[model samples]
Target: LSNKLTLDKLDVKGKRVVMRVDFNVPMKNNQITNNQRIKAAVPSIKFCLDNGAKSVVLMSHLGRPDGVPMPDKYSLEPVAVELKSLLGKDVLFLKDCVGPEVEKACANPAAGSVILLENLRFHVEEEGKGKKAEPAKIEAFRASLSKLGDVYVNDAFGTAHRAHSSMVGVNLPQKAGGFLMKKELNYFAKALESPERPFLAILGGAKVADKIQLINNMLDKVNEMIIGGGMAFTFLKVLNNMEIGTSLFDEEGAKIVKDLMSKAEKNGVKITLPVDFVTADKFDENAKTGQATVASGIPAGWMGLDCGPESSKKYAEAVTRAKQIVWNGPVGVFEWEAFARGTKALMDEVVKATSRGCITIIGGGDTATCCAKWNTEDKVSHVSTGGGASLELLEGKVLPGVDALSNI
Candidate 1:
């Protein structure tokens, strides 16, 4: 449900608003480890409040719960407090997401006030499962939740893949996209729909199977594609017939990649693979490593864990000239200092492009963390919060949560 309708389009005065946000932030000792996702939603929340909305109902999931009441560790109460700090006021934190207590609190909320519901997954039917199996309970739950909001706003791009009740089942009179959702769609359109010339996609990760469809979908759109990380070995094994020892490579993915390379050439898109790799005698971080060895020269009994020095320079060169850049996964095991050079160099190159005003987007998840390791994520154009959701979208799959939204 990609609603073009935004807060600007809604006559929001005195209206009850329910917003789905990605406050699923990491927590430790009841404190947020990273507030970026929480902070990102502030603009949309603030916008609704300023528009004279009677109250805003924010619903989200925290840690994975087995569709039941969770331990204190998985509670969203800390987020409510953190949001209070950001919003400069107190927020009513309800222990139950959909109940008489919550409904009563939301019924007469002061204008511009906020009510944060508990984790939606605690209700068992909230994951969109109970709707099919237990219609009566699901309907009652939605009805109870519906009383809180006259309108529904979906801003949680991270959870857009799931067809949960809070995301799609409320059937609010008005449906809209929050500021972050709008920004994500807008930037994606700029990058893929009508992108500048010389657009590039850097694909790296462990499994080729994961990116098989992603590369196929992107081949028609991107001007070029770069391959690195453990996944690159699959390509090397397929193309060069290299003898990979304990390195990660999918035997089945080779056929898909072979077809893709042929398709890429026919489509006039260049696909790049590392020429060399950082080989390791053992998987342990403390293990001894091999020098920058050519892809075919990887010694027997050793595994390739990271891209070598030459590959880093080669990959970095592609980043400098591209007008549009999208990177996912790291070129190496960037979390460890022993194998961080390739990804570090590539991130620096991305920074160089961003400084030149080229549009550069990090595809979120581990790649976002990889970029943040250098404290240079702020320099990039956008770091997505959605991981699986982002990849599915890049693969051109329609998200059910998004598809379920009311069309304008």
Candidate 2:
């Protein structure tokens, strides 16, 4: 990760800096509902401008337009307005990302101008996929995109896993990572490379099948692993033969529980599983809730919805001793107040760990949602903006966008 060239390495003065940023912000009625993604790209945008770049060309895709120019729904004009306010300067919002007219507009924009290209996904060629795509057209699209900039920078860490045209086909001699991308890579590298002792991985989610590689890969790096969420039932059922009742039990995932445990044991990694659970008569907000330990077992008609109080204490204990922690999913049905206790309790401990100087990372998806719900996002060291991207990174997959950068 450290080998990649950063924005500082490039001479941006008197050059047009074109950057790929993740501006897939949520919207309602043509208004950006949440501008977190937009706000995240500001540092990189400002960096290019502050360093005397002629113009900063920003490109991104909004919601899935499926190759159709749904301007009314997916247009970045609103974003231009928002960015204008955020940057406190005029942003030239181009109507298209490529072709003759777009090229002409970007060819010689005003000095120190901020040009925002239209949605890259507007054309099927951008993704280089789908029935509307043609091999020749994809090449043409990439060629047109390359004409808009003197240097290429990627700040869209959320979209790093994708091998889209903008992500990998720029063919620029000086491709560098923007500040946001650098930070994401550096933090993940710290956890995956030479993490401080007691490196812990807190993994939770619905199916073990989804995180099979993640857990397996972490076993090779982490000193301890905390397995929680709906998937924990599969482990409890397979390892201890405990009845999970109506709880989520992955039959296919259960088959490999022994193998995962064996790998953890072989790697000398401590595996922590919940000792008890908060049981429910039915899977609903109004269901009858009860407490049950591993020895007591869940009732025949009941299902475990969250970790029990004792299990929360154990989770807290594990988190308290860790110097570095990477949390991926919620430990319970955290959407509901009734079932949110376990996740909330675990978050409390993670926050405490952060206060004690633990490098805490909330690995996107539901766990990030947990941080948002508890308003603990700022409390953690890092809450990743990319869900699938972060998961792929942890699973040891090379992201094409990150790999495409110039090596230092």
Candidate 3:
């Protein structure tokens, strides 16, 4: 990592800190469905509280509101109650994230306190002026937010890829990455910088364009690269010079995939593709018929939605022997229970692999969620909170938010 800020650089004593956290946790029926994201930041939050930080101001966004407030979706009130229960202390909730009312709350917040700010996207200024805020608009937002705290600490690795006002635009004489953020970067460094031999990476998801660079970058570093998900069919198509019927194929990514395979061959990297797939008559729950066939045999009327049992077994075997494993995306449409078997089976393999001393890192949104749903998140070494940010890090790209901070 280049010019990164780690937790060791900050002094938490007697300071008011504005910490950006990914509390965009799952919510349903005016309650926090899962507090995993909030819990992940506990170490950092406690560290600051214990070290004498006068007050900690936590800010995050929930579902995308498109800068328009909807009554049911507008409330982050549930987060405040959850934080209070988790921390075992009183928490102040601000109706607005910025402006005079919020500023007043922060100015006189009680010592050893936690304040939960409402959704930052409520204001038109929060999202920025134009379609995607211009630099000037972002700068203005930063200035307004910065005045609320003496220092800025970002623990939200989830939003680190964005140069949003809270994550990056607000920089001070003292700025740092919180414990969770530090942990995120350190985990990535260990997995990518000097990983154990026989390093294996599993790549999935529907978009080849998103993962193309990531696959290419890991090719030189990983021993075996396994491709799965909807994109795997595209690679299979390229391999056999056949058409992938109704399955997702990135036309722009075809050339890149070809080049990546060539690079893997030249570099002596073992790249694995799905030998079989679980085809469905239509993309629905009841349409699934558990038929495993060769990758070349995916019929025109049937769509390849998930990995077949045989392919899953093959992937599990590869995973079992790896010294280091990094998984991104899902092997199938995991939401539908019918197609979820492939992903669930993969999770089992990952957990088993982790128990055997492999350093398992799970990234990407769907993959992380699958691990959580299977209740195996704790078995893995690290489950990255940021999906796109983690992908970019795996691709060896610098994050703008982290880049803007002072290095440790």
Candidate 4:
């Protein structure tokens, strides 16, 4: 990542900067619901304009759309409107992403102009996952995309996991990582490669099967690991034979719990499982809440929905002394008020740690939503914009979008 070329190092002067950004925002009633992703790409877009670029031609996918033109439904028109408001300038919204017509439109735009092409997912060749087009046709699609600009920039870290046409096929003289992409890489690289110890990973989720690789990878890098959420029940049931009742228990993940512990032991990584839980009579917002500890397991027919007060205190103790922290998922069903206390308390600790010079990173998805719920996005060191993308990175996998960038 450090060796890859960045937008700041690239020469955008008098060049048409064609950048791939993630504008796949949630929409409601044909309006942009959240504009975080759009706002994230501002630095790179402004850099091109500030550095004398002739035009900044932006391309992105809005939704699945499945290679069909549904302008009214899956169109990028609403994104264009939101971007215009963010950039405070007029944006030329083209109807198509690639082809002769799109190429013609981008040929000679006004100097310092900003143009946004339509959704790339409207064409099957962009994803190349569906319809199975011929090799020549795919090549033609990539070639057509290449004609749009002189320099290529990838600011879509959210879509970095997919090796789509826009991510890997666009052949340009200079391909660089946008500011948003660079920031993502820099933060992950710093934590995963060389972090100020003691590096603590606070991992939680519903299924242990999903986080095996992530936990495995982090065990080798982190000094301490906290396992909570529903997945903790699986570990507790396997290791301590604690009565988990109706809590989430991965039958397959149970088979390999000892092996994971052995690896953690071999790596000398301290593993912390929840000591207590906030049990519920049923999975509902209005469910009657109860407290249960390892000594007095969750009662039969009851489910553990969140970490209890004692467990949250233990989590805070870990956070207090951690020099770096990487968090993924929430320890509870934070969307429901009854179960959100544990997650909220942990967030407060993380924020306090960040103020004391600890590198606090909130991984994308549920944990990112938790950070947003508490309005702690700016209070932490970095809140990732990509869920699967960040997970892939943490699992020690190289991202295609990052790998495609030119080497510095």
Candidate 5:
């Protein structure tokens, strides 16, 4: 892990600091839904205030409005309200994230105050439309944003995968990671760096296309691998010559799945495939469904939506034996009530595994949602806020925003 200036190393006394936080929390009807992301930045924000930072200026992007000024999709305003409630202090809201107007708002901010800028995506330059932006564009954006503070602190792990203007472009001589950013790196290092023996990985979801490289990379590091979800049907069709009815499959990904399975077997990696699944007439809530033989399941006019009871039990048993567990996707369509049992059951086993001292990391979108739906998000060792970004990190890829910070 990179040695960066964590909250402990910095003395923000009497200084203006620009902090990048993941305030992209879910909102509905102008009210914040999940404040987990906001709560994550509290330590860093509090540190700056208590240590003498003149004022902390926070910046973040909400939903992707694609640089358009959509009234309902705007960020910072709702975030300002939440920050006020959390910090028990006044939070100044800026009309824009960059340019003269925003800089004016920060110029005379009171001590221990927080000023939140509007959505960064509201500006065309922030998103890098059409092509990679030129140096002049980056420099212009940075110059405008940098006027707010003497130092920069990044706590937005959710956007670490991107090298956008607000993230990497703002880094200069006085840049550091906030408390949440440092803690995220530390936790990731504990899980992926020199991990305990008997490491196991579970990959699921639809389309092997997106995770082919991830599967290939993890095959070398993990002892056992479990494949499920729609992706498993593609692998089963390739490896076991089984018929996967209407279960989602990628024809172009068939070759890659075949190669990965073959390589994993040759390298003595234990790979598990779903032996049975719950098949439905169609992809809907009221579709007729039934369990069929593991080997001979999936007939015409039907699709597999979730793992069968036998497969769920087997996967749970496998998960319990691992000293380290990394799960990136759901075993089935967990949104529909009729097809949610298998995924919920798998999540329950994950919670159990964590209780037994197993390092459990949950990544990807649906998997995180499943944990949240089951009210077990706190049970896991780490539930990454970044879904796709976490997957890329797991694939051993460097994040440009995080890499921009100087290593200690």
Candidate 6:
């Protein structure tokens, strides 16, 4: 965390700051459903103002524009309004990402003022859709963007995997990460690079293949790992010849899990799978549901939706005095009341551990949503902003945006 350049280390007194933040949140009909991403970047936003920034230029993409100009539904105007309320300051919304008019507005912003640009995806070049842009156009676009500020601070951890201009195309020399970015990188490094003894990691999700990569990478690095949700069925089926029934399972994922479970065993590590699951006759909330023990396998026409009470207890018992814990993915389908038990119960146990001095980090995506849903986000050590990015970083994969930032 200290090796990379950061916002606090930069000399930004009275200098214009061009900051890229992750404001891509849920939006309803002219309303913001969730402003967590916006609020997450607040610390970085205030840092610029408190440090005497002459102006703050915020750039972010909302939803997916898909390399086309979208004005009706993909506009950033609502975000600007939402941000204004959060920041408690007047915010100006630009119609264009980069242009003469936008550049002019950015050059002379009042002291400590913030200007938010429209959707970056609205411009094709923002998403790398410039018809094979020539070097000249790319350089020109980056140069024009650099004119907005003397420094470029990237706070968009959610978009760190992307190599767009806002991420990598900025030409400023003072490229650094903001508070949120630093926060994510620091915690990830703390958990993976130098975790405490008896460190446990749990991962699950729709596809076991992606999560399996993380598990394989953690074979020798963790104390114990837990697999639940639909992915656990894939492991149970492939390992013990259990009839998964109609539960979700992937062939490639099954192959990967088979190897990972073997690797973890060879490395003297434990890979825990769900002992039982809540199965349903149909994939609907109104369908018949009951608990099925993994030792006996599910009945015909039953699909596993969530981890059962027995499995949740097993998982809870396994949660020993782990100084460091990383929990990604939900224990079950949280949307349905019948299937959300495992996630809710396990989260309560994790939060209790947090109170007992355990460093708990919940990977974003469904787990992060679970944090918000269970009202345990404030109790956890860290709720990551980017889901896939967090998993990859934990798996020891380097992020391009973080790597691109200049070192101090």
> Ranking by lDDT, best first?
4, 2, 6, 5, 1, 3
Candidate 2, residues 1-408, lDDT tens digits: the string is: 578889988899999988999887755446675566677789888888999899999999886787878887889888888998888779999999998998998888889999999999889987776526788889999999988999999998878988999999897789999998888877776677777779888888664566654677768778898889887888898889887888888877777889989999999998889999888899897799998888777889899989988889889888988998888778998876778899999999999999989998886535667786788989998898665577677667789999999999
**Which model, 1 or 4, shows the larger lDDT?**
4
Writing each residue's lDDT as its tens digit, candidate 1 over 112-136 gives 8898999987877787452134778
- Is candidate 5 or 6 superior in lDDT? 6
lDDT by candidate, in order shown:
0.78, 0.84, 0.77, 0.86, 0.79, 0.81
Q: Which stretches of candidate 6 lie over 4 Å from their true place?
A: 26-34, 61-78, 94-111, 118-148, 158-165, 188-193, 206-210, 233-255, 279-304, 396-398
Candidate 5 lDDT, 1-408, residue by residue in tens: 356656577668888989988788765456765677787788889889989999999999887677666656675787888888888778888878888888888877878879889988887677675314456776788788888888889888877876777888784567788877777767776678887767878888764666655778777788888888877888777777877788888787887877887788887788888888888999898899877556786898788888888888889878977898888778888877778887888898988988989988986435666776788889998887665567667667777767877577
Error of 5 at 247 (Å): 7.9
Q: After superposition, how far is residue 205 of candidate 2 from its true place, in Å?
A: 5.5
Candidate 2 weakest lDDT stretch, 10 residues: 26-35
- Prediction 1 global C-alpha lDDT: 0.78
In model 1, the runs with Cα more than 4 Å from the true position are: 1-3, 26-33, 62-77, 94-112, 119-147, 161-164, 191-193, 205-212, 229-255, 274-306, 332-339, 369-372, 382-403
Deviation (Å) of 156 in candidate 5: 1.7
Q: What is the lDDT of residue 132 in candidate 3?
A: 52
Q: Please give, for residues 185-231, the per-residue lDDT of candidate 4 as tens digits.
A: 87787777878899888888664666754677767778898899988
- lDDT by residue for model 3 (295-346), tens: 3576677778888888888888789779988888798988777788888998
* 358 Cα displacement, candidate 2 (Å): 3.0
- Which window of ten consecutive residues has the lowest lDDT sum in model 6? 129-138
The C-alpha TM-scores of every prediction are 0.76, 0.74, 0.82, 0.76, 0.79, 0.79
- Superior by TM-score: candidate 1 or candidate 6: 6
Alpha carbon deviation, residue 45, candidate 2 (Å)? 0.7
